[PDB]
Amino acid sequence: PPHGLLDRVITNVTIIVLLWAVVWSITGSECLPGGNLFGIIILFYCAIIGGKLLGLIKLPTLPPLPSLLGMLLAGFLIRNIPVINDNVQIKHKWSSSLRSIALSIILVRAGLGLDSKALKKLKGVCVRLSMGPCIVEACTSALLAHYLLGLPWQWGFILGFVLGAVSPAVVVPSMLLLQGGGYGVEKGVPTLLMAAGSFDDILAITGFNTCLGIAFSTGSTVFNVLRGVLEVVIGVATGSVLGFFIQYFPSRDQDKLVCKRTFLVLGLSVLAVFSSVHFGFPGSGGLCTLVMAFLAGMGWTSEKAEVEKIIAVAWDIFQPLLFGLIGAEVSIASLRPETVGLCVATVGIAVLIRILTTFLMVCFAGFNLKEKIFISFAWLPKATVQAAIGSVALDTARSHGEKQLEDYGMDVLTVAFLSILITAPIGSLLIGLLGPRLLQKVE
């Protein structure tokens, strides 16, 4: 009987072709070249293959390049080459929905990992580094945007806020592995960097929106700023009652306990994220999800372990989709070759600023010198939020049909997209590599 490497390769080859064939027969022409479902399948497979090649087969001689770069490049190539783009076209409604489900899963993993005791003695620090680096980065980037790019102050600040928000899709997967090995759980570094990801997106989007309106002179600053406060209050209130809801009603006397639990947390997480966007309170589905998952984890003292394993498997299926799609938005017709060298300057200097301010924010928390550096370098990655709100400024500029504001809009897109390419791949490397050396592994 055939066996060994010959057996394994032919088993996967059929599955790839079968998974297309099975979907094709049921759905028909949607799963053929130029169809919505065809775009999803091979973007899934191109991202998976792209991830394997870079990290394992092509270039492992340097410090192991993470699969984030491979998936991000696979979407980049699919989008830009015209011969392979016209045959691969996912609709925007399916694009946002799949990314939102990826966001829903990652927050559930983040919520089910936070240590209650560790979060207790780290509350001022979580607030500081969530809103401290982001505001200073917003100002410092806006200072540079007014001089290196020449954008006015209003367009400087939307550039700052779009460049400010950290991404929990790069940090949380990396720090959960460190928590699995207990590399820093003595003092709470892994829980520090997974809980702070909530409020920085509320500040960034609220900062982006209220500074976007004043650039177009529509709406009022009072509601846009007050919305950000309301996102917090309804996020906790909805999240709190849902947290005690799941913590009791699936009880230890049922049969399909694990199956019923994992459906409840992730199903309500998907409900929270999509409904909040629909009803007009974006970002209240990420604070709700993180709160309800955390509280649900405090009643699931030791029986939460089986839940997160199923969530971990789901993330492995959605990571190629999320990062592959993100690279699929960046074109080269929305970027300007006149300004790429000094659009690296604003991103390059702002990262230096972001590292510097993150040092001071954590400088009074009892951590030693080494953990401050690790937190300083692990707060950089910026992937999901820049993709979500990068093109909003340019898209709104074209809707109003102005002239000069599209020139400003493209530069925001370049900074929003260059930030993903040069920070997220290097952010993942620093978290994985510097982790074991700096943090104190538990005896």
Ligand X SMILES: CCCCCCCC/C=C\CCCCCCCC(=O)O[C@@H](COC(=O)CCCCCCCCCCCCCCC)COP(=O)([O-])OCC[N+](C)(C)C
Ligand Y SMILES: CCCCCCCCCCCCCC
- Residues of this chain that bind ligand CCCCCCCCCCC (CB under 6 A): 8-9, 12-13, 15-17, 20, 32-33, 41-42, 45, 153-154, 157, 207, 210-211, 214, 234, 238, 256, 259-260, 263, 272, 275-276, 279, 281, 284-285, 288
Cα dist from 213 to 75, 102, 333, whole Å: 32, 29, 26
d(C-alpha 225, C-alpha 238), whole Å = 20
Query: How far from 286 is each of 21, 298, 377, CA to CA, in Å?
Result: 36, 19, 24
Nearest to 20 by CA among 41, 40, 51, 39: 41
The span of 149-157, 201-209, 303-311, 364-372 binding Na ion (CB under 5 A) equals 201-209
List the alpha helices (DSSP H) in 59-123.
67-80, 82-85, 92-111, 116-121
Could you give the string, one character per residue 223-262, with x where binding to ligand X holds by CB under 6 A and - elsewhere?
--------------------------------xxxxx--x
| Closer by beta carbon to ligand CCCCCCCCCCC, 16 or else 310 | 16
User: Which of residues 2 and 341 has its CB atom nearest to a second copy in the complex?
Assistant: 2
C-alpha 60 chain-centroid distance: 25
Interface with ligand Y includes 314 (CB under 6 A)? yes
Task: Please count the other Cβ atoms lying within 10 Å of the Cβ belonging to residue 93.
Answer: 9
- The continuous run of DSSP H or E covering 244 comes out as helix 221-248
Stretch 300-319: interaction string toward ligand X, x if CB under 6 A: ----------x--x---x--
Question: Shortest Cβ distance from residue 97 to ligand X (Å)?
Answer: 4
Determine if residue 201 is labeled as part of a ligand binding site.
Answer: yes
Helix (H, G, I), strand (E, B) or coil at 219: coil
Structure tokens, 175: 């720090």
CB closer to ligand CCCCCCCCCCC out of 226 and 332: 226
**Is there a binding annotation on residue 166?**
yes
Distance of CA 297 to the CA centre of its chain: 22
User: Mask 261-280, x = binds a second copy (CB under 8 A)?
Assistant: --xx--xx-xx--xx--x--
Please tell me the distance from the alpha carbon of residue 233 to that of residue 231, in angstroms, as a whole number: 6
Q: Which range of residues in 10-18, 198-206, 364-372, 427-435 is near a second copy by CB under 8 A?
A: 10-18
- Our CB check for ligand CCCCCCCCCCC shows the closer of 217 and 399 to be 217
Residue 115, annotated as binding a ligand: no
Torsions phi, psi of 336, nearest 5?
Answer: -115, 120
Instruction: Tell me if 170 sits within 8 A of 424, measured CB to CB.
Output: yes
Question: Could you tell me the smallest distance in angstroms from the CB atom of residue 59 to ligand CCCCCCCCCCC?
Answer: 18
Chosen from ligand Y, Na ion, a second copy, none, partner binding at 443 (C-beta under 5 to 8 Å by type): none
- Please report, in angstroms and rounded to a whole number, the separation of the first and last CA atoms in the chain: 48
What span, in angstroms and rounded, lies between the C-alpha atoms of 357 and 93?
Answer: 38
- Which of the stretches 3-11, 67-75, 190-198, 304-312 binds a second copy when contact is defined by CB under 8 A? 3-11
Instruction: Give the interface size with ligand X as a residue count (CB under 6 A).
Output: 29
Residue count at the site for Na ion (CB under 5 A)? 5
Is 351 known as a binding-site position? no
The window from 60-68, 92-100, 170-178, 237-245 that contacts ligand X (CB under 6 A) reads 92-100
Cα 315 to the chain's mean position, in Å? 12
Tallying the residues shown for the chain, one arrives at: 443
Q: Give the Cα separation of 439 and 370 in Å (integer).
A: 7
Which residue matches tokens 């909805």?
Answer: 238
Among 201, 231, 308, 371, binds Na ion (CB under 5 A): 201
Q: Say which residue the tokens 């924010």 belong to.
A: 361
Q: What gap in Å lies between CA 324 and CA 67, rounded to an integer? A: 11
Q: How far is the CB of 146 from ligand CCCCCCCCCCC (least distance, A)?
A: 10
Under the binding rule (CB under 6 A), the answer on residue 316 touching ligand Y is yes
The token duo for 298 is 């405090």
In angstroms, rounded to a whole number, what is the distance separating the alpha carbons of residues 102 and 317? 9
Dihedral angle of Cα 120, 125, 126, 128, to the nearest 10 degrees: 150
Instruction: State which of positions 152-191 bind ligand Y (CB under 6 A).
Output: none
Nearer to Na ion, 54 or 169 (CB): 169
Question: Among all chains, which residue has been given the structure tokens 């504001």?
Answer: 405
Instruction: Choose the one of ligand X, a second copy, Na ion, none that binds residue 40, judging by a C-beta under 5 to 8 angstroms depending on kind.
Output: ligand X
The residue ranges that bind ligand Y (CB under 6 A) are 14, 17-18, 21, 48, 101, 309-310, 313-314, 316-317
Residues that bind ligand X (CB under 6 A): 22-23, 26-30, 40-41, 44, 93-94, 97-98, 101, 255-259, 262-263, 266-267, 270, 310, 313, 317, 321
- Annotated binding-site residue numbers for Na(+): 166, 197, 200-201
For a second copy, the binding residues (CB under 8 A) are 1-3, 7-8, 10-11, 14-15, 18-19, 21-22, 25-26, 97, 248-251, 253-254, 260, 263-264, 267-268, 270-271, 274-275, 278
